[PDB]
Design a binder for these strands. Sequence first.
RNA 1: ACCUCGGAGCAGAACCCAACCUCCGAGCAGUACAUGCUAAGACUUCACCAGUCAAAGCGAACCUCAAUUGAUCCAAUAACUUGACCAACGGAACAAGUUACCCUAGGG
RNA 2: GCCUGGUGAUAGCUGGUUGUCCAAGAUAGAAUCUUAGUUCAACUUUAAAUUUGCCCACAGAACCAAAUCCCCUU
RNA 3: GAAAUUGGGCGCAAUAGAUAUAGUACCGCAAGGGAAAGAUGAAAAAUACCAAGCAUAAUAUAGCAAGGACUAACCCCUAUACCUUCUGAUGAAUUAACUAGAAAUAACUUUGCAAGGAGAGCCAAAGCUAAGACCCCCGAAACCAGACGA
Lengths: 287, 97, 140, 95, 181, 190, 107
Amino acid sequence: ARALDLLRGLPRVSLANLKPNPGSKKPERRPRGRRRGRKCGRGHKGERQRGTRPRLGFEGGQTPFYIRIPKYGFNEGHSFRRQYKPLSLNRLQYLIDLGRVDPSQPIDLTQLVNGRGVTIQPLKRDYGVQLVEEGADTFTAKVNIEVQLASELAIAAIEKNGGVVTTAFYDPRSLDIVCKPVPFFLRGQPIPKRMLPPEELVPYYTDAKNRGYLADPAKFPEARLELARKYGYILPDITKDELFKMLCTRKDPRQIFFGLAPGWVVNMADKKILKPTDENLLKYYTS
Amino acid sequence: IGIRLTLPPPKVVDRWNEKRAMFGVYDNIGILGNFEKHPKELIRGPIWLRGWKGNELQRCIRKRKMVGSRMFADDLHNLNKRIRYLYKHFNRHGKFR
Amino acid sequence: LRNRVTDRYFRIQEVLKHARHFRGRKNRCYRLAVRTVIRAFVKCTKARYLKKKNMRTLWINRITAASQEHGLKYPALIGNLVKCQVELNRKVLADLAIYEPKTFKSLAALASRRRHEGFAAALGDGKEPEGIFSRVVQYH
Amino acid sequence: LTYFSARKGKRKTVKAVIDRFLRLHCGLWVRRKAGYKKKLWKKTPARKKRLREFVFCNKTQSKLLDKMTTSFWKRRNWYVDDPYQKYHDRTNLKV
Amino acid sequence: VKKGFRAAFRFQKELERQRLLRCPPPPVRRSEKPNWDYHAEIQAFGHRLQENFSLDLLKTAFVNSCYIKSEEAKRQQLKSNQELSEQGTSFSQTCLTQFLEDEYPDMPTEGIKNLVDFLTGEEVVCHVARNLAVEQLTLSEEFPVPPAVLQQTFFAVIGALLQSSGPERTALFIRDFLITQ
Amino acid sequence: NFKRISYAKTKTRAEVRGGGRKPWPQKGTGRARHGSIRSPLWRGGGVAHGPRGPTSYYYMLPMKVRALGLKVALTVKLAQDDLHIMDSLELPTGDPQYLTELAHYRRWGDSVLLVDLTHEEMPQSIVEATSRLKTFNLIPAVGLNVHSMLKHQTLVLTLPTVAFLEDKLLWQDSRYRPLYPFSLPYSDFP
Amino acid sequence: TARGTPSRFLASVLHNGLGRYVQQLQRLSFSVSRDGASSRGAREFVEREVIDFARRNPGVVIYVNSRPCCVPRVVAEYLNGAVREESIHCKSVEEISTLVQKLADQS
RNA sequence: ACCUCGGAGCAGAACCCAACCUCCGAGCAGUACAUGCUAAGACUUCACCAGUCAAAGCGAACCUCAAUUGAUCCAAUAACUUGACCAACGGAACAAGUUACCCUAGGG
RNA sequence: GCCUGGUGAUAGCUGGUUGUCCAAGAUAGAAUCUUAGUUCAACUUUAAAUUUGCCCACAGAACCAAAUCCCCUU
RNA sequence: GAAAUUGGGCGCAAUAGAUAUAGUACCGCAAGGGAAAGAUGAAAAAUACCAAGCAUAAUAUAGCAAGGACUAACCCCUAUACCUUCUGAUGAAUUAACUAGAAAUAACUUUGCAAGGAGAGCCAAAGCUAAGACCCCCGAAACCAGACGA
Ligand SMILES: [Mg+2]
Ligand SMILES: [Mg+2]
Ligand SMILES: [Mg+2]
Ligand SMILES: [Mg+2]
Ligand SMILES: [Mg+2]
Ligand SMILES: [Mg+2]
Ligand SMILES: [Mg+2]
Ligand SMILES: [Mg+2]
Ligand SMILES: [Mg+2]
Ligand SMILES: [Mg+2]
Ligand SMILES: [Mg+2]
Ligand SMILES: [Mg+2]
Ligand SMILES: [Mg+2]
Ligand SMILES: [Mg+2]
Ligand SMILES: [Mg+2]
Ligand SMILES: [Mg+2]
Ligand SMILES: [Mg+2]
Ligand SMILES: [Mg+2]
Ligand SMILES: [Mg+2]
């Protein structure tokens, strides 16, 4: 740089030389003088000079715009609708290429958060991730994803390449513990059990067509075979290759984290796991 | 004639005071002390405005809910009337809406 | 008072150095001195136009007087000196009238001679020789 | 509206506005037409077809509705089977 | 009591100015004020008039005889001025009579004597030498420099210009400063 | 300005004492219409728009701008030829006059900012020498800021503080956006 | 205004163009702070321009005083004993050069 | 006496144009039951709200009149729909006379 | 009644709104318990993006005066 | 308008700051209202120059009181006081001091980082973070509560 070489010849930078970047500080306009204040910008004496102009929306007496118009329920149940952040396959190929998501392990929702691929916020009632078919062509990855919704074409794009998709469910509580697990293990509570879907979503997660986590593992080869026939690819058998033991692992329902169990208390400090051995707690946590 | 006839005593300022020499130390206690403290935990002042900035109506609301239970009687009363005034001013008066 | 104004003797005194020569309380009481001082500055700038105007009428009075001494009138002198391509102006003619009255007499003689050639030329109309002092110098 | 509440010192939304209008993320407010369910017996079917429409709002109506709601209502919403979801992003404007 | 310093300083100096107008001090000579280098300013006096001097000779042109006497009155607790002033006033009288006999051939010589005794009077020569910075360079006893003394130093400066650079340049000097009066 | 809290407060026309009733009637007197003797026009009235209460001027710049500010202060001190690097701050004697003579001989400057890595492991000699001086100041490496690098003419690091600053400031480049505060546990941070 | 101000007639000092022309400016007196932000343009004027200026007219004797001032000044003195004190406070070198040449050119 | 809507003159020829200005009117009736559904492009009562016109298409056959009217909320109804001389007609969900005892803030 | 408090009551009404210098800048209207006021528009202002704007020639605009609309060239 | 859930002074310095030198003087039957002001020096066992207003120093034809000027103060010539309210009456004896624009949603400008930003929560189809930059003074009749008063 020539610029530090300029700094040799100049006097030392002190607290007496400093100056803001020109354009940063607009100057304060205040009502003194001939221009900035005689009426001081309020105009002639009315109601807008006195300071008492009526509320926003008041049209002076005719019925206002925002009230002449019929109530319709656009926003009727807005805060109970479920939301699902999209994760395109273009995005997920992008994360796999740059080392941010390791495809030689299961891709739960924690692994998409820790790679900072997807930001999901459980308040503002996101119920998790939905896979999105964008970038299905040019998706070249053998992967094991657990994503709460998935379109057919995204299941097809993963399962073509030797992948596994499953759609899990998470409560707001459970989803909140999944996304940011470390501020949960500082909360001192035992790991809870994730709840089953409500009645609206039980027919979703019990269908083998959209790869539900509560569905038969006896109806899956028919569905994998059907997509393989529809979108014209020969269905590879996952059983042959070496990642199969990795590509088979699911956590059962009522299990939030992968290798852990509900009812355990993670002791982050001295790196232990306290497990309960009372029978009533074991009936409650293994329910 | 409101102007003074003799010039005032000189203002002797010690630039190398203890406070001035050590001003600004531990402003970066976060970014180079492994984030164990925030710099806002360096500031001392009223308990209702340590690491918080608001306009006046918000300073009054925050002061009332944070410390208002042990405020003196006519201070509490003056402060209730200031929130009531400043409410009626910010919400119903001005130029822009 | 957080910051009230210290330097106010000098603002007053910026106005009142212009009023020290007024009469009455206008010379001392800022409230009165401001109106009169403003009003004095407005007159002071509108008086530039009137300075130029009044000099010119003063010169026309002096040229009128001095040319009436030689029988001419003012329109005759100015007209028939333009017509001789003597483009002296009113300031110089008034100053010659006072300080050099032989040059002014000879200018009045040149202007009345040109005036008569104007008469004799515009009387005997048709193709004729032009007047001697009536000739112009063409510039190219 | 209320520019600073007495409890939080925040802005408040006018809930009439939410009850009648739909903010699309690009900034367009959708509304329903006034009188679309009144006196249908005396309206021609062209007019009834006009009243049963989701009509966009003006520029100044739009800015008036922006000022009367808060940033919660201006936010991306990834609903499940949203009917209006293809109308959020604005395609193919040349300003 | 309004806090601050700048209005008290401005007001302090305006009070100083009204003190100087109400009771002004007696005028001190210039060599007894700041920013004086005597040698530099004699050289400046040379170059100012557009001629050259022998600087020591011009230095003796400014040294009076009253100054030496009061100086030696101050020793007990220098060439004079008179030779150069004699030569300078003799020469300026004869050259002024040359110019005024050449450009006015019909004048009586009583008239030429009164003209020349005007152009070398105390009023004229003292008016000229207070605007050529002669008075500032005069080593005199008393201030202001009394008019006979300053007349003597002015013609001493003419004598020094004569010995410096001949009769023609002094003729132009006398022409440009005494005749224009 | 972030630590700054102004304690200036004045009284408004409601808080100042008395002045509850009209001084004189509205119309009958020839005087001006007044409503209290404590309105801001009266000698003794409230202040119309004076300073109100303790006000805090708190704001955080992003931590990448504070970190970049530390870097920029270091390159500027080095480029202006005011950085000096020691191996340790161990003096042969604990007198102040030794240290001022050393700083005068090497043409440092009027004021020197000595920086050691920790507050615990500062050598006793530099502590005794700089605890008496007004312009030579010991600071731990945690205490390093920008106001006091600009306030002091020269700045003196040790080699462990240099490795420390490279570590702590090159970390802000090439780090993810935070999931939660860095005081909480991470895979790799402390 | 003209009735408030004094007036005079157009004059010279000693018939200044008749015989010869004499530079009416005797002394300049610059006073310049060594450390001080207001006499920066004065400093760069002494370093760059004052020697060239002092050579372009040798009848003028120039004193640069260089004390700790808080406002720098130039003090022009004239042959007829007038003194014009002007400030060179926070001026560039070019502005000071035009001011000093202005003081040189006048009487 | 009036308060909303329409026609004509004022306002002669694109549009617009007031008045306690000049004259007429309106607050429906009749026929049809595809007076179904959709949809390019437009006009527009000087804003908004409301208003108007409409090709192609699917489905079928093989509206007249100028005005002829009323927002939102609320009700009633399973639903489709329906609801004001809210005529002060951009409509406050429901409120009369009077004060030489008037009072205050202002204007002439 | 008077006092204290609510209370800095409220006021579409009256009065008042403090350095300098430069720049751009004035007359369609619609609703309104509305005509001493507000809201929208029109006009005004700054910043930005782009491409035409203004003046206009033939041709052209209905039956029962002066002009205008439209409009390439320039 | 919730909840679950989460976790000493960039103060004032005698019209300022407290009403405060004092709830005193004074006013009121009472409840109640409620002031003002001081400045030597180390020692008192050491007794300047500046507001308005005037005085020194009254006045000379003619006129918003000046301006152009001028040898010259006046005489000559030019010149319908200021604020505010109207398309074009109001208030001010004069001096000093006091006395009136408070909000960062969105946009803009300037940085940082950037498919991510932010020191959790929040936003993100180039965004996000930070800063800068916008919103006055006085004035009723009243209404209500509690006292004090025949
Ligand atoms: Mg003229
Ligand atoms: Mg009160
Ligand atoms: Mg009041
Ligand atoms: Mg006060
Ligand atoms: Mg006070
Ligand atoms: Mg229109
Ligand atoms: Mg009505
Ligand atoms: Mg109406
Ligand atoms: Mg008010
Ligand atoms: Mg009102
Ligand atoms: Mg202009
Ligand atoms: Mg109404
Ligand atoms: Mg009104
Ligand atoms: Mg065209
Ligand atoms: Mg007080
Ligand atoms: Mg006086
Ligand atoms: Mg007159
Ligand atoms: Mg004014
Ligand atoms: Mg009794």
